[PDB]
Write an enzyme that holds these catalytic residues in place. Sequence first.
Site, PDB file in Angstrom:
ATOM      1  N   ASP A   1     -54.453  47.844 139.877  1.00 12.99           N
ATOM      2  CA  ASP A   1     -53.950  49.223 139.811  1.00 12.99           C
ATOM      3  C   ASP A   1     -55.002  50.315 139.605  1.00 12.99           C
ATOM      4  O   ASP A   1     -54.668  51.495 139.667  1.00 12.99           O
ATOM      5  CB  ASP A   1     -52.903  49.368 138.691  1.00 12.99           C
ATOM      6  CG  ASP A   1     -51.506  48.993 139.132  1.00 12.99           C
ATOM      7  OD1 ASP A   1     -51.031  47.909 138.752  1.00 12.99           O
ATOM      8  OD2 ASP A   1     -50.876  49.801 139.848  1.00 12.99           O
TER       9      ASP A   1
ATOM     10  N   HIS B   1     -44.200  46.816 127.319  1.00 21.77           N
ATOM     11  CA  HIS B   1     -43.787  47.783 126.314  1.00 21.77           C
ATOM     12  C   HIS B   1     -42.512  48.538 126.698  1.00 21.77           C
ATOM     13  O   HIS B   1     -41.949  49.252 125.869  1.00 21.77           O
ATOM     14  CB  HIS B   1     -44.934  48.761 126.031  1.00 21.77           C
ATOM     15  CG  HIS B   1     -45.464  49.453 127.249  1.00 21.77           C
ATOM     16  ND1 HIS B   1     -45.119  50.745 127.585  1.00 21.77           N
ATOM     17  CD2 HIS B   1     -46.339  49.040 128.197  1.00 21.77           C
ATOM     18  CE1 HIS B   1     -45.744  51.090 128.697  1.00 21.77           C
ATOM     19  NE2 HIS B   1     -46.493  50.074 129.088  1.00 21.77           N
TER      20      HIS B   1
ATOM     21  N   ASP C   1     -45.803  43.191 133.831  1.00 21.29           N
ATOM     22  CA  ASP C   1     -46.032  44.619 133.953  1.00 21.29           C
ATOM     23  C   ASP C   1     -45.239  45.435 132.957  1.00 21.29           C
ATOM     24  O   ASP C   1     -44.050  45.184 132.744  1.00 21.29           O
ATOM     25  CB  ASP C   1     -45.700  45.096 135.372  1.00 21.29           C
ATOM     26  CG  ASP C   1     -44.245  44.842 135.755  1.00 21.29           C
ATOM     27  OD1 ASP C   1     -43.454  45.807 135.867  1.00 21.29           O
ATOM     28  OD2 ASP C   1     -43.885  43.653 135.899  1.00 21.29           O
TER      29      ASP C   1
END
Length: 1526
Positions: free
Chosen positions: A668, A536, A533
């Site tokens: 999600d 970045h 998850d």
Amino acid sequence: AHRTLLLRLSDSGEPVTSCSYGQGVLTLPSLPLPQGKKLGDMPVYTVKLAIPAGSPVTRDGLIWTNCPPDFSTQFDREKFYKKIIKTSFHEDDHIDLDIYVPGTYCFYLSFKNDKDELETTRKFYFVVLPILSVNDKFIPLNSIAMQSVVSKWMGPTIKDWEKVFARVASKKYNMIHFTPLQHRGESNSPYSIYDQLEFDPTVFKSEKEVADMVERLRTEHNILSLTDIVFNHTANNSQWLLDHPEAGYNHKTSPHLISAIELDKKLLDFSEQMEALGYPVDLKTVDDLIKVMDGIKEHVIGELKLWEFYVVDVKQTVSELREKWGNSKSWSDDNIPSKDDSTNLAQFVRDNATEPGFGSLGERGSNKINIDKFAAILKKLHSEDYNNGIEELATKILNDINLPFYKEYDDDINEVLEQLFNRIKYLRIDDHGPKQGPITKKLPLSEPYFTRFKAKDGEEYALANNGWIWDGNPLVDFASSQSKAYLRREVIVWGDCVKLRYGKGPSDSPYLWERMSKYVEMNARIFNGFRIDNCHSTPLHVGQYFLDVARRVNPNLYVVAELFSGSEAMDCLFVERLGISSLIREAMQAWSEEELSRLVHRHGGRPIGSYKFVPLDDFPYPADVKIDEEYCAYNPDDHSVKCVSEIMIPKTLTATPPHALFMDCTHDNETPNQKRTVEDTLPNAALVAFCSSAIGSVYGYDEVFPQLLDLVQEKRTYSCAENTGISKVKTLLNNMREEIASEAVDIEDSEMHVHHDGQYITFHRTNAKNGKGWYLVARTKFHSSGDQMLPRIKLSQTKATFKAAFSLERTGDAPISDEIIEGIPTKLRELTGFDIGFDENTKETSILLPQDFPQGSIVIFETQQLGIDDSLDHFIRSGAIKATEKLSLESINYVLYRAEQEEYDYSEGRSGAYDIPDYGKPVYCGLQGWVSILRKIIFYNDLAHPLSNNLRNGHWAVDYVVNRLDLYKDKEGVAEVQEWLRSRMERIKQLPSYLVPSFFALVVGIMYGCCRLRAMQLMSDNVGKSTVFVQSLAMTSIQMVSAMKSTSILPDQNIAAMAAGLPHFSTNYMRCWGRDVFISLRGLLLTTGRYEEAKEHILAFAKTLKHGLIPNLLDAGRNPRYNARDAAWFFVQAIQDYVTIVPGGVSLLQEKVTRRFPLDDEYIPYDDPKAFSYSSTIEEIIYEILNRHAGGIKYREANAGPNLDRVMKDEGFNVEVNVDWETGLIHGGSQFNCGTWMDKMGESEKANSVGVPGTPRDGAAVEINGLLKSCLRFVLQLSKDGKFKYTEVTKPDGSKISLSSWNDLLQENFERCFYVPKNKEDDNKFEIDATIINRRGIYKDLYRSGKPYEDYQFRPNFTIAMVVAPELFTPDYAAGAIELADQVLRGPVGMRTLDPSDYNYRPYYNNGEDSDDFATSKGRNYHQGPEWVWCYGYFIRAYHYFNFLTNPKCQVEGSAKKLKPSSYLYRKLYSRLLKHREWIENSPWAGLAELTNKDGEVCNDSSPTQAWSTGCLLDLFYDLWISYEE
């Protein structure tokens, strides 16, 4: 067998892009190991690094790589190993990296700089993907289907789960993705993990229990498994977080947050107190909310101190100015601004009187003034006595110092509470997301920006919790001191989770790294891979350490990530460095039907009939190479990566964009039901499943769960209701991809077309190898939006089959249980009606949809391209090397080259070069002409190019390639090359039109390479084994040597004949030119090994001697023209060159040419018996030249009259030549003349120059005397060996001179006559008139010419003498003079024919210029400034030679002690040939120009490819080779 990729490097060590596929990564394709071998048995891959001969980077150069050296050794990121680059000026070096195991490798290079310092390239990475198998059938990484399952809704037991498994297993997914299976935190969100080191105790107790479950999945259902992994946070209540609070960012570890902490507990302390104060715990008005943050106004902001956090304490500084006034009591500099500049005094103090960390944040009053350096300034500036104006002044300054701090604060505060009155609206009053829960224990107004606890050390602590900035840069750590996000409240938080503060490594938070290290290896022992998850937001060094740890546990770790960095570039870096194997893409993100087809386009594949890569004219072709000779050294079990043809140049390793895992729905995103509609579930999933990539989906999508499950709250369990909604269709799609996955392999082998009409999206998926495909028509249900009819679907040269069709229909609403999550009810109706027309003539399938095809439907066809079968690519890639078995260096000219005019020669003007409509013609007629156009076309896959357009429009270019060779059919090997091209082109024409360009460009490419290889083999080793540049240069030889019809070098016969240039110096009388031939002969014929045809050319011209001289214009030796004073000496140098180089070469001297004129200079009788009448040996010929010059030659040119030269003047036609014997040098010509190479005869009537030569070179010319000298040397030592009979030379009277005296006279007198000394001092012995002079330290252009300044001209010619007669030059003077040439006369690609500083100097040549200018009109300029390329070779050959003798820096040690040149010199040499390599690289004619205008500027009248331009460069390489490489 063969598992090797080629990775070419630039001259700066950077990897080279074979293709343009996009911003990318050096991925190596996943492939099973060979048949029955494990990791270790052999290398998985070998990467061949290829480093350019002579490049800067070869200099004491090393390849560095962190690739382990065999299997036993463990991968360490920063343990790089050393590899030695074998320098050479001629040959590229190849260095293998063997790779034993998947992962993230890199390399950089070190080399010694042009400043003799060390330097270092960028690190460059390449990923080696993991092998996934399941029991022992390999799963191709792009036929992955993955089901995401949230554990806490699977039932509280393992076999409540094994139920779930059995359901997905039926839908034929082969991967499951697990949200993390770890004991969860207070809110029980599965991402706020309580304890990393053991699993959920509800279900599991040990590693062994979970391991068995996952091995069970494997063995039972053939399903691989992988977890989420979380790095960025942990649950707000871990019992180790009490032990180790420093692993988060607290008032200790990260001080800056202190201000933000006392703002956060000024609302855990405000919003329970909040019901006593003020009106609104909950209300939904808008004039109301002012009365709330007017409660923030005074109760929080007002009671937090004007923020002493920024601002200097004005009076409690002054306070402490009176205290210690007395210690360091004055300055005495004048660093002093005065009180005029009230703002420059203000931060003068800021610079000089501050304690560390001023300006930045910390504890409450942490910004403050160094008081005794403050008093010390104030003492100097105003007074030593405090009571004189200091309270005013000190205060004034400090108020000015906090002006920017105050406006730092106002800007700060307005964001603190704006970010707050906009939140709490959508947190309470619903803009788009409801729920106005008032206060509670558990829900204040504002969220916990920090987690508070009493620790086991005793002290209290405030660790924040992470989240994300709204539109911030995620590469920024917002907890770090760089950010102000926790203060200004620019943080959307997660209370569930708490900060994890790793540092720059393990020293910065030691326990954290240790715990996560055995967290990570735990899951690695069990699972096939991770998922990550918000990766970045994991800092790169963190991510790299742990994934590397993971990969030591699990070599074949697969890794997925939701990665949306700032850009495609930073995505690719992360992928590069972390070793990510897939990136998550989300189907549901598309707001619209257009956004969706665009998305599906990206991960769909390559366009249909896309161009296939081949080695072209940009690769070396080692003569000594292995071949598949009928493309048959492959075995499918070996699982070898395959060469593009019969030649083994290996597969190239090029950037490709990082792979994808495409999710029709993630855990999600909102549901089809929510965001669009439920019926969309079917088409949306089909479009995704047709992508050539990996696909997945959340559980619920397929079973049409009505709304997104709230990861935090919900406790209901997945229904056991089997086979609902799409289940039965996913079984189909995944099964279909299984059949597929078996044969598609890399980016070039699966192609696509996607069309979006309205609410339909079409998707054609096709295999480039066999032509099988699948056509999906997909009607989409973003909204119900009216009936829409789709046009007829036309497939060209394709047959099509119905496979299946479905509509998915909503049967009312979803049930409302409270312990079982349940689907919407749906009907899945099979459809019919689809009409499939086939025209047996046009071979066109048409496809009509039936009017009952409701939105939310799909239909799938299987489809087969006609004419393609599996065996096509073998065919096309085989036979080509045997078919070239019989070619010869001459016959290859006909296959590869042939300018239009040269072709017209063979076709009586009928044929020429194929005209590509909207474009033009290729520049050669043969394959080089295609290849020069194709190379970019293929590189950019430009199917829009006029040639691409033409090639699918018709078979004309296809047939033209095969038919031309009828002209040259009878030539050695051309018949069987034609038949190969016939048989292949035949078979190509049977394909679908749109496939023809890719395949045409492949057949041509394959034959080209085979041809170019064949040449290299027939040539000599030095050439057959060198860089692209040299072989490029060499191939020119084949461009220039051709048999013809309209001319030859022999009057009785047509035979091979070196043109001077293409296209304009190729036919009739315009082809052969003695000067040209014999300058170029060593370059293009000796150096290349073309011995027998060097001989033919010497013998040919030897027939035509007259006036003791060789003619320039050669008319096949039928009326040649003898206005050439230069030619005979270039020809008697060519003969020396031949003898020097060719084995047994003295054999030439007794070869007998029928001499076909008479031994006087008698008239012209081409048709008498006195033509064939008498024999000469080359032996007599050479002396006949040397001796006839000596006694003297005087004549007027035969047939002289305007019918040869119609601008030369009456006197011009008598020219002659003899020897001044006080000096021993030859003289000749006049002012009406042009006997040198610089032979431009002027002709402009308007400029008034008709019959004036631009550059007569009357008298003693440097070349000719250089060459003479070299002739004399040659014969002397030939005499000494008994190979030359003669020492006798008769002079005009009757006197005699030994040849060796003539030799010595030049030696005693040449330098004396031509040199122009540096020192005025010695002008009295080098024969100089100093009035007429330009630059000293020069070698003269001419001795005693008609107009004396033309004597003292700086020109490139003297170089030829330096090269051929070095004995004539005292090293130091020569060195100096050639240095001047380098500085003054050297253009980028060619040599300046006249010194720029001369007033005659005109460096632009235009042949048509009409105007009245004496120096320029109609070309007179030709040799007074234009930059000529052949001159360069002579120039640099000499620059090499004399720097090597002169400059100590240009030598180093030998092996078996012989002086070879230093790399310092090689660099200088290499520098001076870049522009040439550039030129022949990037020129449609694969060659070097004759000439250039000033400073590189292209000259439109210059011939684009010239024999001597390239021959002279080759001459250099041969020097270097034959002098040093042994």
